[PDB]
């Protein structure tokens, strides 16, 4: 020990610090802002792997509800919306199982619409599953849970 | 976009030039607890102690008051008193609640009485009535 | 409910509960009418009126709310206000039969 | 009478149904330009304001009396906009004028 | 069926013809 | 030291408390058990604190004993506990000062 | 009244040619619930979908130019700009993205929509776009500074199509509240609120040469000049399906797609339905599915392009029907 | 081996639960198995299955099937619309304390639409109510002394909905405006003062 | 339970926060244009 | 500040032995630590009925119990514990003991096993 000549190391550290200046100013500054004035209404972002599927489902449900509203007249429709949603869910479940979803009271048009949306879901779902499988085959950052789902989903598909 | 400050004649001072600074979202208004631009002026250059605006312009408009004095824009009387007089010839109920006060502030109805004070028609009439009552 | 303070406490609590239920299902309109009814019962006509107005704002296209509100207005023998309300309703919604009939 | 005034018949009536050669003109070029300028100026201004607000770097009269407004340079350490604190605010709708919501005109199946 | 029948053509398109890198609009300005 | 109690009675915390007591006079009369035999408490402030604590305890007892399942024996037991608390409070109101 | 009916009878509509199917391009593996064309040229048209992708399509050949994979959830709408070489797209992932077309790669994801965003309209004149979602709010963006400049509070429910005109009525929203609004972006407020529909006006479109805006609830296609914000006509849409699309052609040939899939055409301003077209679907697909979800014409106007729920895009080439009112 | 009470319970559970949820049901019947339970249900319990006998023609058909799908018996059953074992049989042809306890348990289960969160919440509410009444009682007791009712402690700036009036929407100033309304309101309020006093 | 579906979303405007979001940072200041 | 924290800060004068002694001195006075029925989280192995209100708390159901030491050990040098529980509906103190002769538990005036 006893080698001086700190210059290049020093230079390197200085240059590193340059990058940080900006990052710290956004970060530390942001933190202090929060401390003084702490955020009102943040917006989550579905481009995340997590929450995507749920969001999609919700959207689909909303669409279906809208379609049903468009379809025919109603009085106190809020109550009926829930029922519609339930029906849709049941249909989806049936599809997953490969049970025919035949309900006698369901009127042709509404039923038809529900069927179409479940088909759409299947298309979106099956394709997604396939993609996941492909990824798995490759070795491409699959989530353990995701892989499990794929295994399950794919099994179900096979059974069907 | 921003509206102008409503500072009374006696509030502001006796001179033909005053310099003031505006501080956008300076403080929260005392009534509403909602950010607004502080104007603060020194009256005469050398005369000590500033005169900061304590309320938001909207609130002032609603009550029809000086943003410093907290007195009627017209008659320079405390809000209670001015309103009381009008009643004698209904008064404002500032709702002392965290959320509700803000809502009240944002409403633009001229709370109670303020309308009368604003209009030459109405204020003058009220005054006349008061005079009659007195006599 | 013996004393005034007790009543206030009760009433306040009820109001809070109603608010809580609203905040979630703002677009319900059964809850709103219930709230209005409660207010009426309490004999705070202002509050009830406000609630009805709020409900209307939430869902203007809901005849039941309108009709109940009208009834409430009329119930308290406050006809002129009721009349005004009716007029407003009519203005809002001509092609609904019911308001006119009312 | 008031009610009548509030909601008029011509609202329900389509205007083209009587006169077909009647066409709404595509707006005047100059007018369009003017509109663009107005909005462009405004939107630009708004954006500038927003930028100013963001915490990252990069005259008047009252009554008869004349009054000079200033903006003092606050210290760059202290919070720029010391007023604001991320407050929740419910707003009233404030819809004084009444929207006319106009319209026209087997239950066991549906 | 009827999309298949008569004279009207159905095109099955899996593969994109033009490459992925190439532009959909270009902006050339002076040589 | 899961579940917080352990953390509270971890040695470091105890040491800190002791230090506080030594310098400035921060005690937590919640934290220590109130003594059985009064007249082993020459200071007045301490006595007052103890009294306050007992009052608080009594209040707590009161709050719970009017619960809806009134026929359960816990409530009955508390009634005696309440009495005891009251007695303690009374005692604490001794006439030395 | 008799005074109006007689007048209507007296007046005649122009003989618009009928429409026959030409191209069908089963390429997407999902609904094709958006479609758009280039203002400048009419070589390609892109179509966002429930695939999550959006694909570009050469009109002449019908061949798939190229794909674009910049969303997670399904694309709800797109808008190629006339004034810039940007393609805006928007998906229920809450992302209003912006594709350069010199490089076919996203640039400015605009952020601000709380939930699934339904439509875009680029402002014809400004460098500003406008988007609206189930949010119940139509935000306008400065494209440079990728921030919402203003927002438009008025609506009381999810807002679907939100067209941009170059005049004062600069945005023409259309909700599930069944109001269609005319706004003043500059004022930060509404100007006129067309409430004439009964249900969710889930379709609306600006007329190219005529400064008016057809709009469609479950049945009745209204159409209006938005100068005053005054009704122009009511179309013969009496028992047609739930109107999904409502594109207008250059030559006053308003098209309407349904949830039925019954492609209905009308003379514009007349209010005269002058054709119906039965849908079609693939042998494997079901008869309930077939439904024109998105559609638009080319700038010339001889080709209507309809994205239908068969995972297809159908392009349509070109004795009129008798009048008979009520 | 299957007892009849148990079978009945299972049936009840199925109506309560769901013909594709065979874990809960299994749990409900302490001795019988999950996968067994489902099988049992398939065999006996479900009404749509025609466990009863049928005409000679049907029998003939069954026998024909048997000949022409060599003992592919599930398939045959399916074709029939009959259950399998029974069909096969046809072809071939041509303690108390426990019960009491289990029943009690089962009954409790099926009836009670409850768990942790359902039971807890109601209980909590009840407790709160009790507390409130206790408070009231206390104030009554100490009425000769001046006493104020304790407010619900705020958490993050909320409104006490007695005062202030909450987010008010307007009366909406109309054309046929008359000033008796105010008077009426006053009159109404007069009565409530009296009530308060008594 | 409270595991619950829904009726409507929201859009309510408050005072801006003044927070330095990462994405919001400047980028592509130059807008392109078409030829005409 | 982070659960895997290597070293807790000590004051500049912290005689550890002395500190310990001090703590001990202020442990007899202390409320908690100088008491029985220290808390615990446990699932119920017995699957039993609450004797008051007959609430059938099943196997593996989780509770915040009180573990207390029974002074009378099993044999000599292997301790046994009382494990208090409350029934969900009625607040009756159920408990049980762990007699390790049978490798199992014993009910203690709370409920009955079935
Ligand atoms: Zn003043």
Domain boundaries, chain H: 1-198
Q: In chain D, what residues touch B25 (CB-CB under 8 Å)? A: 81-84
Beta strands (DSSP E) in B1-135 are 19-28, 35-41, 51-52
- Count of CA atoms in the C-beta half-sphere (13 A) of A54: 10
The rounded distance, in Å, linking the Cα atoms of B122 and B75 is 13
C-alpha distance from D28 to closest chain B C-alpha (Å): 29
Measured between CB atoms, does C26 come within 8 Å of chain H?
A: no
Of J58, J88, J114, the CB nearest to H101: J114
At G180, which helix (H) or strand (E)? strand G180-184
Neighbouring chains of B at 3+ CB pairs under 8 Å are: D, H
J48 is in an annotated binding site: no
Of J20, J30, J90, the CB nearest to F9: J30
Q: In chain H, what residues touch B98 (CB-CB under 8 Å)? A: 157-159
J28 is in an annotated binding site: no
With b for 16 or more beta-carbon neighbours within 10 A and e for fewer, the D88-101 pattern comes to ebeebeeeeebebb
Chains H and B touch (3+ CB pairs under 8 A): yes
- Count of CA atoms in the C-beta half-sphere (13 A) of H28: 25
Q: Where along chain B do its domains lie?
A: 1-135
Experiment type: cryo-EM
Distance of CA G145 to the CA centre of its chain: 27
The rounded distance, in Å, linking the Cα atoms of G162 and G96 is 14
Cα(G188) to ligand 1 centroid in Å equals 32
- 8-state DSSP, B36: E
Q: Which residues on neighbouring strands pair with residue J30, listed in sequence order?
A: F32
The rounded distance, in Å, linking the Cα atoms of J78 and J72 is 10
Neighbouring chains of E at 3+ CB pairs under 8 Å are: G, I
Look at residue H131 and give its three-state secondary structure: helix
Binary contact (D98, C61; C-beta < 8 A): no
How would you classify the pairing of strands E9-10 and G20-24?
parallel
Binary contact (I20, D50; C-beta < 8 A): no
Tell which residue, B29, A11, D79, H180, has the closest CA to residue C82: H180
Distance of CA G184 to the CA centre of its chain: 21
How would you classify the pairing of strands D65-70 and B19-28?
parallel
Q: Which residues on neighbouring strands pair with residue B78, listed in sequence order?
A: B71
Binary contact (F8, J29; C-beta < 8 A): no
- 8-state DSSP, D9: G
Contacts of residue B75, Cβ cutoff 8 Å, sequence gap at least 6: B82, B117, B123
Residue I23: CB atoms within 10 A of its CB come to 11
Cα(G260) to ligand 1 centroid in Å equals 69
J87 is in an annotated binding site: yes
Chain J residue with the nearest C-alpha to that of H28: J58
The rounded distance, in Å, linking the Cα atoms of G170 and G182 is 7
Q: Which residues on neighbouring strands pair with residue G292, listed in sequence order?
A: G308
Binary contact (C25, I8; C-beta < 8 A): no
Chains J and H touch (3+ CB pairs under 8 A): yes
Chains B and D touch (3+ CB pairs under 8 A): yes
Contacts of residue B35, Cβ cutoff 8 Å, sequence gap at least 6: B25, B26, B27, B28, D81, D83, D84, D85, D87, I15
Binary contact (J88, H116; C-beta < 8 A): yes
Q: How far is CA I35 from CA E21, E26, G84, H151, I32, in A?
A: 22, 9, 9, 70, 10
C-alpha distance from J80 to closest chain H C-alpha (Å): 30
Q: In chain I, what residues touch E25 (CB-CB under 8 Å)? A: 34
CB-based contacts of G102-107 (< 8 A; 24+ apart in sequence): G102/E23, G102/E25, G102/E26, G102/E27, G102/I32, G103/E23, G104/E20, G104/E21, G104/E22, G104/E23, G104/E24, G104/G66, G104/G68, G105/G70, G106/G70, G107/I28
Tell which residue, B80, B28, B82, has the closest CA to residue B56: B28
Q: Please answer whether residues G75 and G53 qualify as being in contact, where contact means their C-beta atoms are separated by less than 8 angstroms.
A: yes
Of E3, E20, E25, the CB nearest to G24: E3
Q: Please answer whether residues G44 and G60 qualify as being in contact, where contact means their C-beta atoms are separated by less than 8 angstroms.
A: no
Q: In chain I, what residues touch C25 (CB-CB under 8 Å)? A: 7
Q: Which domains are present in chain G?
A: 1-326 (2.130.10.10)
Measured between CB atoms, does C81 come within 8 Å of chain H?
A: yes
The rounded distance, in Å, linking the Cα atoms of C61 and G177 is 9
Look at residue H142 and give its three-state secondary structure: coil
C-alpha distance from J46 to closest chain F C-alpha (Å): 25
Largest CA distance in chain A: 91
Look at residue F2 and give its three-state secondary structure: coil
Q: Please answer whether residues G82 and G40 qualify as being in contact, where contact means their C-beta atoms are separated by less than 8 angstroms.
A: yes
Chains J and C touch (3+ CB pairs under 8 A): no
Residue C93: CB atoms within 10 A of its CB come to 25
Residue C79: CB atoms within 10 A of its CB come to 15
Q: In chain G, what residues touch D26 (CB-CB under 8 Å)? A: 209-211
Chain A residue with the nearest C-alpha to that of I23: A26
Look at residue G281 and give its three-state secondary structure: coil
Burial class (CB in 10 A: 0-12, 13-18, 19+), H27: middle
Tell which residue, D99, C98, F4, has the closest CA to residue G195: D99
Binary contact (D79, A72; C-beta < 8 A): no
Q: Which residues on neighbouring strands pair with residue J97, listed in sequence order?
A: J82, J106
J109 is in an annotated binding site: no
The rounded distance, in Å, linking the Cα atoms of C34 and I33 is 59
The rounded distance, in Å, linking the Cα atoms of C35 and C48 is 8
Where do we find the tokens 């579906």?
Answer: I5
Interface mutation vs chain J, best among F11, F36, F72, most J CBs within 10 Å: F11
How would you classify the pairing of strands G138-142 and G253-258?
unpaired
Of D12, D15, D27, the CB nearest to G232: D15
Cα(D82) to ligand 1 centroid in Å equals 24
Measured between CB atoms, does G94 come within 8 Å of chain A?
A: yes
What does this entry list as its resolution, in Å?
A: 3.8
Q: How far is CA J3 from CA F11, F15, J7, in A?
A: 18, 21, 11
């Amino acid at each position: 020990p006893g080698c001086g000549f700190w210059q290049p190391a020093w230079r390197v550290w200085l240059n590193f610090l340059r990058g940080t200046i900006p990052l710290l100013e956004r970060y530390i500054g942001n933190l202090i802002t929060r401390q003084f004035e702490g955020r009102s209404n943040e917006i989550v972002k579905t481009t995340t792997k997590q929450r995507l599927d749920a969001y999609y489902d919700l959207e689909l449900r909303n669409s279906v509800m809208d379609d049903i509203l468009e379809m025919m007249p109603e009085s106190i429709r809020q109550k009926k919306a829930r029922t519609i949603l339930q029906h849709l869910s049941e249909a989806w479940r049936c599809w997953k199982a490969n049970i025919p979803w035949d309900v006698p009271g369901m009127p042709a048009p509404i039923k038809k619409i529900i069927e179409r949306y479940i088909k759409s879901k299947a298309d979106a779902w099956v394709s997604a599953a396939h993609y996941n499988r492909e990824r798995i085959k490759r070795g491409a950052h699959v989530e353990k849970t995701m892989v499990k789902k794929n295994l399950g989903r794919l099994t179900r598909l096979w059974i069907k | 976009n921003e509206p102008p400050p409503n500072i009374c004649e006696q509030c502001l001072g006796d001179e033909a030039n005053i310099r003031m600074t505006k501080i956008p979202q300076g403080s929260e208004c005392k009534i509403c607890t909602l950010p607004f631009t502080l104007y603060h002026f020194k009256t005469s250059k050398r005369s000590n102690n500033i005169i900061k605006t304590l309320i938001c312009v909207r609130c002032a408009t609603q009550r029809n008051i000086c943003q410093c004095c907290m007195l009627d824009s017209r008659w320079h009387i405390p809000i209670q008193l001015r309103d009381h007089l009008i009643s004698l010839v209904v008064m404002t109920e500032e709702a002392k609640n965290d959320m509700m006060k803000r809502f009240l502030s944002l409403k633009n109805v001229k709370l109670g009485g303020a309308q009368i004070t604003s209009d030459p028609s109405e204020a003058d009439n009220i005054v006349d009535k008061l005079k009659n009552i007195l006599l | 409910i013996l004393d005034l303070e007790e009543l206030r406490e009760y009433q306040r609590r009820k109001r809070t509960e109603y608010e809580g239920y609203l905040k979630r299902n703002r677009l319900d309109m059964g809850q709103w009418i219930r709230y209005a009814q409660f207010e009426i019962e309490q004999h705070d006509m202002r509050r009830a009126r406000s609630i009805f107005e709020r409900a209307l704002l939430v869902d203007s296209s809901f005849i039941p709310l309108w009709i109940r509100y009208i009834d409430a207005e009329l119930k308290v023998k406050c006809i002129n206000h009721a009349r005004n309300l009716m007029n407003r309703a009519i203005s809002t919604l001509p092609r609904v039969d019911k308001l006119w009939y009312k | 009478d008031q009610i009548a005034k509030n909601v008029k018949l011509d609202d329900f009536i389509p205007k083209r149904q009587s006169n077909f050669e009647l066409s709404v003109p595509l707006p005047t070029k100059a007018e369009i330009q003017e509109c663009t300028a107005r909005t462009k100026s405004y939107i630009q201004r708004l954006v500038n304001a927003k930028l100013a607000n963001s915490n990252n770097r990069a005259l008047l009269l009252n009554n008869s009396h004349h009054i000079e407004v200033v903006s003092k340079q606050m210290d760059p350490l202290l919070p720029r906009f010391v007023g604001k604190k991320a407050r929740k605010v419910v707003a009233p709708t404030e819809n004084d004028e009444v929207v006319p919501v106009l319209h026209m005109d087997d239950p066991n199946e549906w | 069926g009827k999309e298949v029948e008569v004279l009207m053509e159905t095109k099955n398109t899996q593969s994109p013809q033009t490459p992925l890198v190439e532009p959909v609009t270009e902006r050339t300005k002076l040589q | 030291m899961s579940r917080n109690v352990d953390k509270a009675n971890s040695v470091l915390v105890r040491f800190q408390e002791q230090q506080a007591e030594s310098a400035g006079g921060y005690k937590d009369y919640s934290r220590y058990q109130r003594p059985r035999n009064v007249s082993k408490v020459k200071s007045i402030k301490e006595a007052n604190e103890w009294k306050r604590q007992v009052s608080k305890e009594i209040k707590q007892k009161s709050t719970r004993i009017y619960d809806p399942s009134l026929n359960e024996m816990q409530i009955a037991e508390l009634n005696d506990e309440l009495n005891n608390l009251f007695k303690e409070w009374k005692r604490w109101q001794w006439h030395i000062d | 009244i008799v005074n109006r009916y007689e007048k209507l009878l007296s007046q005649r509509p122009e003989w618009h040619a009928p429409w026959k199917l030409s191209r069908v391009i089963n390429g997407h593996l999902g609904w094709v619930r958006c479609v758009a064309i280039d203002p400048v040229d009419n070589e390609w048209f892109i179509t966002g979908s429930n695939d999550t992708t959006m694909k570009v399509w050469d009109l002449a050949t019908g061949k798939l130019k190229t794909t674009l994979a910049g969303h997670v959830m399904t694309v709800r709408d797109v808008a190629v700009s006339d004034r810039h070489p940007y393609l805006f797209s928007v998906s229920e992932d809450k992302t209003v993205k912006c594709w350069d077309l010199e490089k076919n790669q996203i640039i400015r994801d605009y952020y601000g929509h709380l939930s699934g965003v339904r439509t875009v309209s680029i402002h014809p004149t400004l460098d500003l776009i406008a988007t609206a979602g189930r949010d119940s709010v139509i935000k306008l963006w400065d494209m440079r500074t990728r921030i919402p400049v203003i927002t438009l509070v008025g609506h009381k429910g999810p807002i679907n199509q939100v067209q941009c005109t170059p005049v004062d009525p600069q945005v023409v929203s259309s909700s599930t509240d069944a109001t269609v609004r005319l706004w003043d972006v500059v004022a930060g407020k509404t100007m006129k609120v067309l409430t004439h529909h009964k249900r969710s006006v889930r379709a609306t479109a600006l007329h190219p040469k005529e400064f008016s805006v057809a709009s469609a609830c479950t049945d009745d296609i209204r159409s209006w000049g938005l100068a005053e914000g005054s009704l122009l006509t009511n179309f013969e849409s009496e028992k047609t399906g739930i109107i999904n699309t409502l594109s207008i052609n250059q030559d006053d040939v308003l098209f309407a797609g349904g949830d039925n899939g019954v492609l209905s055409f009308y003379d514009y301003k007349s209010g005269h339905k002058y054709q119906s077209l039965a849908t079609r679907e693939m042998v494997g697909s079901l008869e309930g599915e077939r439904s024109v979800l998105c559609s638009t014409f080319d700038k010339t106007g001889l080709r209507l392009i309809t994205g239908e729920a068969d995972k297809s895009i159908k392009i349509w080439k070109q004795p009129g029907l008798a009048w008979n009112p009520n | 081996v299957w007892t009849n009470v148990e079978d009945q319970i299972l049936k009840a559970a199925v109506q309560k639960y769901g013909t594709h949820q065979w874990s809960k049901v299994a749990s409900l019947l302490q001795k019988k198995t999950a996968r067994q339970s489902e099988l049992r249900w398939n065999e006996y319990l479900n009404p749509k299955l025609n466990f009863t006998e049928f005409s000679k023609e049907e029998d003939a058909q069954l026998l024909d099937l048997a000949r022409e799908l060599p003992n592919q018996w599930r398939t045959i059953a399916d074709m029939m619309a009959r259950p399998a074992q029974v069909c096969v049989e046809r072809y071939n042809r041509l303690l108390e304390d426990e019960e009491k306890e289990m029943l009690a348990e089962a009954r409790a289960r099926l009836l009670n639409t409850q768990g942790k969160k359902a039971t807890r919440k109601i209980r909590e509410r009840m407790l709160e109510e009790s507390k409130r009444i206790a408070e009231l009682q206390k104030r009554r007791e100490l009425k000769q002394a001046g006493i104020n009712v304790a407010i619900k402690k705020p958490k993050k700036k909320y409104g006490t909905d007695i005062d202030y009036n909450e987010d008010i929407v307007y009366e909406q100033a109309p054309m046929p405006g008359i000033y008796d309304t105010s008077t009426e309101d006053r009159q109404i309020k007069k009565k409530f003062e009296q009530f308060e006093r008594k | 339970p409270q595991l619950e579906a829904r009726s409507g979303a929201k859009a309510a405007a408050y005072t801006p926060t003044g927070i330095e979001h990462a994405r919001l940072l400047p980028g592509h200041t130059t807008l392109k244009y078409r030829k005409f | 500040s982070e659960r895997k924290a290597i070293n807790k800060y000590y004051p500049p004068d912290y005689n550890p032995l002395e500190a310990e002694k001090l703590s001990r001195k202020m442990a007899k006075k202390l409320k908690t630590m100088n008491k029985s029925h220290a808390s615990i989280r446990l699932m119920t192995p017995f699957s039993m009925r609450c004797l008051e209100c007959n609430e059938y708390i099943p196997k593996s159901r989780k509770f915040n119990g009180k573990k207390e030491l029974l002074k009378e050990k099993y044999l000599d040098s292997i301790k046994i514990y009382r494990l208090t529980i409350s029934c969900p509906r009625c607040a009756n103190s159920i408990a049980f003991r762990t007699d390790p002769g049978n490798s199992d538990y014993v009910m203690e005036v709370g409920g009955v096993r079935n």
